[PDB]
């Protein structure tokens, strides 16, 4: 009996075994549903895809292959729903997305 990872049968990239391990070790319920780690890991993969895509957009806009935290912070403050999700979150080497106020301009 060959052993394949359950994420393969889920066709995903993040290790659902490690997921369910953290789940049981997380003291959330007496017994975790079978497909619940699968579902949440799928959500995780999707959102990671979104954020990494935004980061790659920013970096290539800046003509950069290696993506520095600044790109990610900019994308964060560029996605309104993601920002809402993460506005309460602080970002190392984030800096501030360029924001210029009106009355600040000269004449």
């Amino acid at each position: 009996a060959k052993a394949k990872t359950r994420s393969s049968r889920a066709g995903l990239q993040f290790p659902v075994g490690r997921v369910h391990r953290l789940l049981r070790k997380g003291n959330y319920a007496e017994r975790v549903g079978a497909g619940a780690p699968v579902y949440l890991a799928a959500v995780l993969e999707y959102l990671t895809a979104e954020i990494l895509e935004l980061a790659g957009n920013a970096a290539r806009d800046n003509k950069k292959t290696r993506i520095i935290p600044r790109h990610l912070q900019l994308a964060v403050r560029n996605d309104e729903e993601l920002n809402k999700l993460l506005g309460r979150v602080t970002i190392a080497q984030g800096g501030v997305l360029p924001n210029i106020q009106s009355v600040l301009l000269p004449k």
Partner: protein, 93 residues
Amino acid sequence: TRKESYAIYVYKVLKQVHPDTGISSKAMSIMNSFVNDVFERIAGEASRLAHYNKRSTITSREIQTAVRLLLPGELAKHAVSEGTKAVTKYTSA
């Protein structure tokens, strides 16, 4: 000491979305911390709602409901659809 992370899967899904891109290990650690944050968030919320439902079993319905509670609008919608498709795929075999 055997320490576990996800940066390998980060690189994987990166190539899946951007094959010609590099990352700062700093940024990888940031993203992994973000992974951990969202994971603990969703897990705590699910456990709490199950407690409200007096449920000792956290299943995919809990998952979807808690994501909807957490993610806004199309973020939540796409995430729900994706988790649904994935659990369907896994349950197909």
